[PDB]
UniProtKB/Swiss-Prot annotation:
Function, in words: One of the essential components for the initiation of protein synthesis. Protects formylmethionyl-tRNA from spontaneous hydrolysis and promotes its binding to the 30S ribosomal subunits. Also involved in the hydrolysis of GTP during the formation of the 70S ribosomal complex.
TM ranges: none
Superkingdom of the source species: Bacteria
Record-given protein name: Translation initiation factor IF-2
Origin organism lineage: Bacteria, Bacillati, Bacillota, Bacilli, Bacillales
Family statement drawn from the similarity comment of this UniProt entry: Belongs to the TRAFAC class translation factor GTPase superfamily. Classic translation factor GTPase family. IF-2 subfamily.
Compartmental location: Cytoplasm
Amino acid sequence: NEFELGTRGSSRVDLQEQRSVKTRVSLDDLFEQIKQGEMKELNLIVKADVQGSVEALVAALQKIDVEGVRVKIIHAAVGAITESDISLATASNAIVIGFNVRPDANAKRAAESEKVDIRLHRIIYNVIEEIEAAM
């Protein structure tokens, strides 16, 4: 509706700040501040049956200082996935990437009961179609 449409005598004066007036404000938006948790920081443990396979990977992993996605190693060892090492996995959130090494039957259990699944022997796990009883 609006009662009395007339002249807005606001631009008849000098134009400075507090132009809105009453509902005026300089800085009202408080800062949340930035926080790099986007890409996350990826931690892992390297294990292989060849010691210098671990070291070679670690040497590439420790030099990861690239801005954005940080990936770093927490532990390296020449061995397969052992129960004791899994406890590091859930500790530093570093998962164990084993190169065809594989775990103990209890470690494989421990891993999962420790919130950390281990990945190894990733030649091919044929999850694509069970070709039998299939048509």
